[PDB]
């Protein structure tokens, strides 16, 4: 039996004193559950995580919540393990904070549920898969230009009101429909207004029922904002390792995770590294990112939103994050205004994932011709406006007429879009999108109006739409 | 136990021995009646932050415990006063007569207690209301430049609340006391004092009060918010609250961070700004919207505290001295400014006509460099430039003159529907003024319809009214 | 009672008190010591109590040099802060930080009224809140930065741009007219400049209504910390007891904060941003808030403020900005072009220009001058390459007037004769506003631009062009 006492309280930092032979390990969780003895006191229900062993049987810890109302000599209980959160089917359709307690109103998880530690080593070298495997999403633009790798890290870039949250809910829907995977969403340093908005949007989607969901609010202390991503990763790892399936993990703002780590380092008093970041920046990022991989029995693939601190891509946080990306996807307000949803333009991803192996024979020849055609049209877009309306009209109209049909055929009707417009929505395999783009590049379909190619699934539906409009 | 003796004092803090049962954040009293706040509980001493004049305290003096956390008075009586970060009056006029209290550190509402923001906060400035709308329950940062008029934006927003059933709380942090009095006399004249309650912590006060002032303001706002009212809170300078806290934490010898700020400086302002929420109907339907204001020294927003607040809020309004001297006032940079609630925070009539306005302004801005060469452009570009000049003219406004939302919507409709592209760009301001008078005289049905339905009137009647006015313009 | 010296580290001294009668903070201490033998020196030194330590010990800041002190010397607690004489007796005299006359005209009697240097600032109910304009006779100011009677004026600028010349011109133009008392405080700047100003005041006769306090660069940081408060106390007496109108001139109030930062590390504080003391804003507000007008009298305060590297984001200037009713910001680019006084016409917010008073005649002229000078800045980078041909038609009409407006904003000062070879001029606001309206109307586009330089009235420009041979 072991239980300590509070000895120092300095903001979010607490020091605890233990008997000589029963100090906790360096990531264990500690509980304080105090009932106010008299009106000069207050109730507290705080959780602490051990951070350092200082000597003299004291440990330094970080609070996962407010430390107001603490008193020296208060009794602390050592749980004997890291923060352990519930895993499995019970997580589906729920919302959790960092500690695994639901912050939704739909009740609480029964005490006999199974719970996994938030801290854990990465999979062994022998346990990793021996080769690359493309994750097919059913989205034409991505699966052609920027194919996701099982176990890969994909960077999602974009502005505002361009369709990030629709693209996320559509990925969750297509993955759960065609492959059978669940997903976990982990917002790190979430604005609470935006967390309430996302929960109600996703509820309506009933993709909430797959979604299982963890939030770390912007107004929580740095330890909680540091660990919310690890709790989400643990809930996804359960489904990879137990159910043997391919999972999806979404992290809203990896930058906020690194920023919380820096704040914690300053609190613990470590010497700052370059540009003020914590000395352990790379190790912390690597420990998070190396647990997202494909094993022999499943995989996790992660869509991660990345904020560039000053639009400086050489800044340490963006550099250390970009060191792990397998792919990228950028969203354009110009296309969102042209009416081309999803509004994607995902170029860097072409080079790693697509080119060499899988696609490199058939699909890489088609995808390279699509990219060259759309690049030519961008150069033409300046000259087209004045002179080029006439001067392109013979020679370059062969390029422009085909390039606008390719640009329209890259858009698509999303399942999740049916609530905006009455369109059922479609799932398009990779070999069908390779086929259709090969035909359009061959000029089979030039006689059809450009508008027939817009916001449709397979190529055949273009023929049907044209036949319907004349 | 519950008493101790002072062992060191100076620079507005003191170290005490004893007080074993004191808790973090407790209020504490020295033998003179000076209060302190227990912020550091260490092995053998207590670090106390002194909330008054400390020069009467000596080593060896006793110190005693009050047994309670920081609390603030709250109630309808604070309305029309001037008060401390503590509830103490500062205006004269006698005591305040509150009946109850609120902790300075209440929890923010959760995920499940909120409803999406959906009703506007009318500032009365055309540029704001049209292009950077603010809703009730939103947090919007107003980043000004000290040569432009940046403080008048908040004061005119507060004065415009007079018929909108809203309480307000101006918080002055680290301001000069004769300028907080100039603000009080300005609000007084407006009878804006009569809702406005006012908290002040001037530069001469101890650092702890400057550090507590925004929390006291928000704690007075939440009383009315949870009763069901809508309240507006203006933070005059959060960077000065941050400086006060940094001073305290360095004097208590805590590790320094990026600019000597402590590791919890982000968490300080997150705690503050997440209390502004739009409550769900099961919780009463009240709301609290915050407007933090910051003064720049040239355009630089790259300081640490401005970056933190920018990341925490829902949008920012940008005012630039380059626009202010080139004749564009209020001098808002519509391209750089943003609101993330936008659209949802506008009435139907505005949401109908603001999009075309935004389009025209953006096209004009991207065409500006071609304007020097007008004689040579195609007719489409000439049309775009002609529209942009007029749009910029109609977005101008005079300081301290608000406009009703219905008049704003009507003039924007006149602009975006082509009625105004006959007038020379130098007649646009005068045209707008005379149009407002004409509306007052004989567009009462249109004005009433907008007020009642929050929607655009019948297009044919509107067009007849606009053409009729043009028939009498010169 | 009696204490002893324990440590000596430059300006900071540690003293121990025996019987539990510690001096309060801000109390003055005396060390008076006649040599006991030929291996010592005589000491007469004053210390100000700053901190209480444990073990009956105090940190103090010396008000003079600490050379010669020995460990064990006896220290006397005077029981109160530093106190200085107030009243008529101070008029016409020159004092140091301790209230000792440094002129050769005698010594103040022992029984005279003597007030303490440390004091709380006036309360919210007792502040004066009305704006009357103050005419300086300087074209750029009276047009683009009007001073407030009873307000705060700040003159910003880096080294060698003309702050002191401008302060002396303001004294020359306003003090003789003023029907009240004047006070000057030299804080950390040049003894040569102090001697010059004193002799000029003497020759004029204004010295009979003026009190001067000097602590210059050669003083230890304690004197440079407290000299401004000595001057402030002397001015507060006249504001309060006599109800007089006071002019308070402070030369380089930046040295006050700089001296604080000199002592901070020896006092034992941790450094703040850019190496300043953590208590910079608090210490500055303590002094600044006492300088204000009330219902019993007014203080019109003009301060020169040093900007360390023309970097206006430096914490000292950045904090000073929030205390000023009007500012003038001096520009090195103008100084290098030979445009004196070199005021930057934008930065001043013209704040008093606060539309009403100026509003009809003067406000339209002032804003049209600023609009013309704003456009010329934007043009200057275009102007070089493309601009001098392309601008030559449309924008050269703006440039031609901006060159002339900018040359006409300069002036010849009375106190600048040793620099200009000319006597000075005094321009009333009516003539200023008239002249700038003429130049904007184009009544003088034909005169050469060089005629506009370093003159007063516009008739003087016409005469100078005539002399040039126009
Ligand atoms: N595939 C789509 N089909 C139709 N409309 C869409 C589609 N994707 C996005 N939108 C429109 O754009 C809006 C973008 O919303 P959302 O994805 O939440 O924005 P954001 O990019 O900020 O996260 C939607 O509410 C909808 O109006
Ligand atoms: N009005 C002026 N006319 C002519 N020369 C000036 C004027 N103002 C400043 N100068 C020049 O600039 C120098 C430095 O000015 P000074 O008063 O020392 O400014 P600061 O106090 O900011 O260093 C002067 O010695 C003088 O040569
Ligand atoms: Mg979004
Ligand atoms: Mg000087």
* Sequence-ordered alpha helix ranges (H) in C278-354: 280-288, 315-320, 332-337
* DSSP tally for chain C: helices H, then strands E: 15, 17
- Tell me how crowded residue B209 is: count the other CB atoms within 10 A of its CB: 20
Distance (Å, rounded) from C-alpha B470 to C-alpha B202? Answer: 53
Distance of residue B269 Cα from the nearest chain A Cα, in angstroms: 8
What are the DSSP calls for A340-389, one per residue?
-SS-B--THHIIIIITTTTTTTHHHHHHHHHHHHHHHHHHHHHHIIIIIH
Distance (Å, rounded) from C-alpha A48 to C-alpha A30? Answer: 5
Q: Strand pairing of A75-78 and A84-86?
A: unpaired
Judge contact between A11 and A267, C-beta under 8 A.
yes
Cα A55 to chain center, whole Å?
40
What are the DSSP calls for B197-254, one per residue?
--EEE-TTS-HHHHHHHHHHHHHHHHHHHHHT-EEEEEES-HHHHHHHHHHHHHHTT-
Angle at the Cα of C47 (from C41 to C48), degrees rounded to 5? 175
Cis bond leading into C16, ω under 30°?
no
3-state secondary structure of A185: strand
Distance (Å, rounded) from C-alpha C418 to C-alpha A117? Answer: 81
* Sequence-ordered alpha helix ranges (H) in C205-253: 221-240
Chains A–B, number of C-beta pairs less than 8 Å apart: 129
Read off φ and ψ for residue B139, nearest 5 degrees: -115, 125
The token duo for C191 is 């003894």
Distance A251 CA to ligand 3 centre (A): 13
Judge contact between C439 and C408, C-beta under 8 A.
yes
B303 reaches A (C-beta below 8 A): no
Strand ranges inside C409-468, DSSP E: none
Exposed, middle or buried: residue C26 (CB in 10 Å: 0-12, 13-18, 19+)?
middle
Distance of residue B267 Cα from the nearest chain A Cα, in angstroms: 6
Read off φ and ψ for residue B100, nearest 5 degrees: -155, -175
Judge contact between A264 and A226, C-beta under 8 A.
yes
Distance (Å, rounded) from C-alpha A180 to C-alpha A170? Answer: 14
Positions of chain breaks in chain A, given as the residue before each break (C to N > 2.5 Å): none
The token duo for A452 is 């027939």
> What residues in C contact B176, CB-CB < 8 Å?
288-289, 322-323
What one-character DSSP code corresponds to residue B319? B
What one-character DSSP code corresponds to residue A123? P
Read off φ and ψ for residue A135, nearest 5 degrees: -90, 110
The token duo for B422 is 């006959």
Distance C420 CA to ligand 2 centre (A): 11
Judge contact between A344 and A142, C-beta under 8 A.
yes
Angle at the Cα of B233 (from B227 to B239), degrees rounded to 5? 140
Distance (Å, rounded) from C-alpha A287 to C-alpha A257? Answer: 13
Residues 6+ apart with CB under 8 A from C328: C140, C141, C145, C153, C154, C155, C156, C166, C343, C344, C347, C348
Q: Using the beta-carbon criterion (under 8 Å), do B177 and C53 form an inter-chain contact?
A: no
Q: In a mutagenesis test of the B interface, which of C270, C301, C312 is the best target, namely the one with the most B β-carbons within 10 Å? A: C270
Exposed, middle or buried: residue A300 (CB in 10 Å: 0-12, 13-18, 19+)?
buried
Task: Look at the block and give the residue holding tokens 């901070």.
Answer: C264
Helical (H) or strand (E) element with B102: strand B100-103
What one-character DSSP code corresponds to residue C387? I
Read off φ and ψ for residue B136, nearest 5 degrees: -80, 120
Task: Look at the block and give the residue holding tokens 């082509």.
Answer: B418
Q: Look at ligand 2, atom 24, and give the residue with the nearest C-alpha.
A: C162
Exposed, middle or buried: residue C110 (CB in 10 Å: 0-12, 13-18, 19+)?
exposed
Judge contact between C281 and B243, C-beta under 8 A.
yes
Please identify which of the residues A72, A114, A191, A270 carries the catalytic annotation.
A191
Give the closest residue to C154 by CA, choosing from C254, C239, C275: C254
Please identify which of the residues A49, A136, A170, A190 carries the catalytic annotation.
A190
Read off φ and ψ for residue A217, nearest 5 degrees: -75, 155
Distance (Å, rounded) from C-alpha B306 to C-alpha A98? Answer: 28
Residue of A nearest to B381 (CA): A386
Using CA atoms of B294, B298, B299, B300 in order, give the dihedral in degrees to the nearest 10.
-80
Q: Using the beta-carbon criterion (under 8 Å), do C321 and B91 form an inter-chain contact?
A: no
Long-range interactions of A50-54: CB distance < 8 A, separation 24+ = A50/A24, A50/A25, A50/A26, A51/A26, A51/A268, A52/A26, A52/A268, A53/A23, A53/A26, A54/A15
Judge contact between C195 and C260, C-beta under 8 A.
no
Cis bond leading into C341, ω under 30°?
yes
Judge contact between C346 and B321, C-beta under 8 A.
yes
- Tell me how crowded residue A27 is: count the other CB atoms within 10 A of its CB: 16
- Tell me how crowded residue B334 is: count the other CB atoms within 10 A of its CB: 21
What are the DSSP calls for B163-189, one per residue?
GTT-EEEEEEES--HHHHHHHHHHHHH
Query: What resolution, expressed in A, was reported for this entry?
Result: 2.7
Q: Using the beta-carbon criterion (under 8 Å), do B12 and C282 form an inter-chain contact?
A: yes
3-state secondary structure of C321: helix
Distance (Å, rounded) from C-alpha A263 to C-alpha A222? Answer: 6
Judge contact between A262 and A316, C-beta under 8 A.
no
Distance of residue B354 Cα from the nearest chain C Cα, in angstroms: 29
Give the closest residue to C184 by CA, choosing from C108, C235, C219: C235
CA separation (Å) from A439 to A72, A136, A409? 76, 21, 12
Distance C167 CA to ligand 4 centre (A): 9
- From C160, C189, C309, the mutation candidate for ligand 2 (largest count of ligand atoms within 8 A of CB) is C160
Cβ contact B–C (≥3 pairs, < 8 Å): yes
Cis bond leading into B204, ω under 30°?
no
Give the closest residue to B150 by CA, choosing from B270, B311, B291: B291
**What is the 3-class SS of B424-474, one letter each residue?**
CCCCHHHHHHHHHHHHHHHCHHHHHHHHHHCCCCCHHHHHHHHHHHHCCCC
The dihedral sign for the CA sequence B124, B128, B133, B137: negative
The answer on whether C161 is annotated among ligand-binding residues is yes
Distance (Å, rounded) from C-alpha C144 to C-alpha B15? Answer: 51
Ligand 2 atom closest to Cα of residue C341? 1
CA separation (Å) from A131 to A296, A326, A353, B334, C452? 10, 14, 12, 51, 81
Distance (Å, rounded) from C-alpha C435 to C-alpha C438? Answer: 5
Read off φ and ψ for residue A211, nearest 5 degrees: -60, -10
Judge contact between A295 and A123, C-beta under 8 A.
yes
Compute the 3-state secondary structure of chain A and give helix, strand, coil in percent, each to the nearest 5. Answer: 40, 20, 40
Give the closest residue to C52 by CA, choosing from B326, A73, A138, B55: B55
The answer to whether the CB of C160 is under 6 A from ligand 2 is yes
Task: Give me the residues of B, 434-473, that contact C with CB < 8 A.
Answer: none
CA separation (Å) from B320 to A175, B108, B124, B330, C213? 48, 34, 20, 9, 42
- From A140, A163, A168, A194, the mutation candidate for ligand 1 (largest count of ligand atoms within 8 A of CB) is A163
Helical (H) or strand (E) element with C183: strand C181-187
Task: Look at the block and give the residue holding tokens 């705690």.
Answer: B271
Q: Using the beta-carbon criterion (under 8 Å), do A71 and B23 form an inter-chain contact?
A: yes
Compute the 3-state secondary structure of chain C and give helix, strand, coil in percent, each to the nearest 5. Answer: 40, 20, 40
**What is the 3-class SS of C15-26, one letter each residue?**
EEECCCCCCCCC
Helical (H) or strand (E) element with A59: strand A58-63
> What residues in B contact A222, CB-CB < 8 Å?
263-264, 266-267
Exposed, middle or buried: residue C241 (CB in 10 Å: 0-12, 13-18, 19+)?
middle
Distance (Å, rounded) from C-alpha A59 to C-alpha A50? Answer: 7
Give the closest residue to A10 by CA, choosing from A212, A257, A246, A266: A266
Distance (Å, rounded) from C-alpha A368 to C-alpha A406? Answer: 13
- Strand-pairing partners, residue C300, are C247
The token duo for A136 is 């097919």
B12 reaches C (C-beta below 8 A): yes
Please identify which of the residues B68, B258, B340, B451 carries the catalytic annotation.
B340
Residue of A nearest to B270 (CA): A219
Task: Look at the block and give the residue holding tokens 């929420």.
Answer: B277
Ligand 1 atom closest to Cα of residue A342? 1
Give the closest residue to C326 by CA, choosing from C171, C455, C160, C136: C136
Task: Look at the block and give the residue holding tokens 């991505």.
Answer: A142
Judge contact between C266 and C12, C-beta under 8 A.
yes
Helices B151-159 and B177-189 sit at what angle, rounded to 10 degrees?
Answer: 30
Neighbours of chain C (3+ CB pairs under 8 A): B
CA separation (Å) from B196 to A312, B76, B228? 43, 11, 17
Q: Look at ligand 2, atom 11, and give the residue with the nearest C-alpha.
A: C162
Judge contact between B116 and B314, C-beta under 8 A.
no
């Amino acid at each position: 039996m072991t239980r300590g006492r509070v000895i120092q309280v300095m903001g979010p930092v607490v020091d605890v004193k233990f008997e000589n032979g029963h100090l906790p390990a360096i990531y264990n969780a500690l509980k304080i559950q105090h009932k106010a003895r008299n009106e000069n006191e207050v109730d507290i229900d705080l959780t602490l995580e051990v951070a350092l062993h200082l000597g003299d049987d004291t440990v330094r810890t970080i609070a996962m919540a407010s430390t107001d109302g603490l008193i020296r000599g208060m009794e602390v209980i050592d749980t004997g393990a890291p923060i352990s959160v519930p895993v499995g089917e019970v997580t589906l359709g729920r919302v959790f904070n960092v500690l695994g307690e639901p912050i939704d109103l739909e009740g609480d998880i029964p005490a006999d549920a199974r719970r996994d530690p938030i801290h854990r080593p990465a999979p062994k070298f022998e346990e990793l898969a021996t080769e690359v495997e493309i994750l097919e999403t059913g989205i034409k633009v991505v699966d052609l230009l920027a194919p996701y790798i099982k176990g890969g890290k994909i960077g999602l870039f974009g502005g505002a009101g361009v369709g990030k949250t629709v693209l996320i809910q559509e990925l969750i829907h297509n993955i759960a429909q065609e492959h059978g995977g669940i997903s976990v969403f982990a917002g790190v340093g979430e604005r609470t207004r935006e967390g309430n908005d996302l929960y109600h949007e996703m509820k309506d989607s009933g993709v909430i029922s797959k979604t299982a969901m963890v939030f770390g609010q912007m107004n929580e202390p740095p330890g909680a904002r540091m660990r919310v991503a690890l709790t989400g990763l643990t809930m996804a790892e359960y489904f990879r390792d137990e159910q043997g399936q391919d999972v999806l993990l979404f992290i809203d703002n990896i930058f906020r995770f690194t920023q919380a780590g820096s704040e914690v380092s300053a609190l613990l008093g470590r010497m700052p590294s370059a540009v003020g970041y914590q000395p352990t920046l790379a190790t912390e990022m690597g420990q998070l990112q190396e647990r997202i991989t494909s094993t022999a029995k499943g995989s996790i693939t992660s869509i991660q939103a990345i904020y560039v601190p000053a639009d400086d891509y050489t800044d340490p946080a963006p550099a250390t994050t970009f060191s792990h990306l397998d792919a990228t996807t950028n969203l354009e307000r110009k296309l969102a205004e042209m009416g081309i949803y999803p509004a994607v333009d995902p170029l860097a991803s072409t080079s790693r994932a697509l080119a060499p192996e899988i696609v490199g024979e058939e699909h890489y020849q088609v995808a390279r011709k699509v990219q060259q055609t759309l690049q030519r049209y961008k150069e033409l877009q300046d000259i087209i406006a004045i002179l080029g309306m006439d001067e392109l009209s013979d020679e370059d109209k062969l390029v422009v007429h085909r390039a606008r049909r390719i640009q329209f055929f890259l858009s698509q009707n999303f399942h999740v879009a049916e609530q905006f417009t009455g369109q059922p929505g479609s799932y398009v395999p990779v070999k069908e999108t390779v086929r259709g783009f090969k035909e359009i590049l061959e000029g089979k379909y030039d006689h059809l109006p450009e508008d027939a190619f817009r916001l449709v699934g397979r190529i055949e539906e273009v023929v049907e739409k044209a036949k319907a409009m004349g | 136990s519950d008493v101790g003796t002072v062992i060191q004092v100076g620079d507005g803090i003191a170290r005490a021995h004893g007080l074993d049962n004191v808790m973090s954040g407790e209020l504490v009293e020295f033998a003179n009646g000076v209060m302190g706040m227990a912020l550091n509980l260490e092995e053998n001493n207590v670090g106390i932050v002194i909330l008054g004049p400390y020069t009467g305290i000596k080593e060896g003096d006793e110190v005693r415990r009050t047994g309670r956390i920081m609390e603030v008075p709250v109630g309808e009586a604070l309305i029309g006063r001037v008060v401390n970060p503590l509830g103490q009056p500062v205006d004269g006029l006698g005591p305040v007569e509150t009946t109850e209290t609120r902790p300075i550190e209440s929890r923010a509402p959760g995920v499940m207690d909120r409803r999406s923001v959906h009703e506007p906060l009318q500032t009365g400035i055309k540029a704001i209301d049209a292009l950077v709308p603010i809703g009730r329950g939103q947090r919007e940062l107003i980043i000004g430049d000290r040569q432009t008029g940046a403080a008048s934006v908040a004061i005119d927003t507060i004065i415009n609340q007079k018929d909108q059933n809203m309480i307000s709380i101006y918080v002055a942090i680290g301001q000069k006391e004769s300028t907080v009095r100039t603000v009080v006399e300005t609000l007084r004249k407006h009878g804006a004092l009569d809702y406005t309650i006012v908290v002040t912590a001037s530069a001469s006060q101890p650092a702890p009060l400057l550090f507590l002032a925004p929390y006291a303001g928000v704690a007075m706002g939440e009383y009315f918010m949870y009763k069901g009212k809508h309240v507006l809170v203006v933070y005059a300078a959060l960077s000065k609250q941050a400086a006060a806290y940094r001073e305290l934490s360095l004097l208590l010898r805590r590790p320094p961070g990026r600019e000597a700020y402590p590791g919890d400086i982000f968490y300080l302002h997150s705690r503050l700004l997440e209390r502004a929420a739009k409550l769900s109907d099961a919780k009463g339907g009240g709301s609290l919207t915050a407007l933090p204001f910051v003064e720049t020294q040239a355009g630089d927003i790259s300081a640490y505290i401005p970056t933190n607040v920018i990341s925490i809020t829902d949008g920012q309004i940008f005012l630039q001295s380059d626009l202010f001297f080139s004749g564009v006032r209020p001098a808002i940079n519509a391209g750089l400014s943003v609101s993330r609630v936008g659209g949802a925070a506008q009435i139907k009539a505005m949401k109908k006509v603001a999009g075309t306005l935004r389009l025209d302004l953006a096209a004009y801005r991207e065409l500006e460099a071609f304007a020097q060469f007008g004689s040579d452009l195609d007719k489409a570009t000439q049309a775009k430039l002609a529209r942009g000049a007029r749009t910029v003219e109609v977005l101008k406004q005079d300081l301290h003159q608000p406009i009703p939302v219905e008049k704003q919507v009507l003039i924007i409709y006149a602009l975006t529907r082509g009625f105004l592209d006959d007038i020379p760009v130098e007649d646009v301001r005068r045209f707008e003024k005379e149009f407002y008078l004409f509306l007052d005289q004989n567009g009462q049905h249109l004005l009433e319809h907008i007020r009642t339905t929050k929607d655009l009137p019948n297009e044919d009647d509107l067009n007849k009214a606009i053409e009729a006015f043009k028939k009498t313009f010169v």
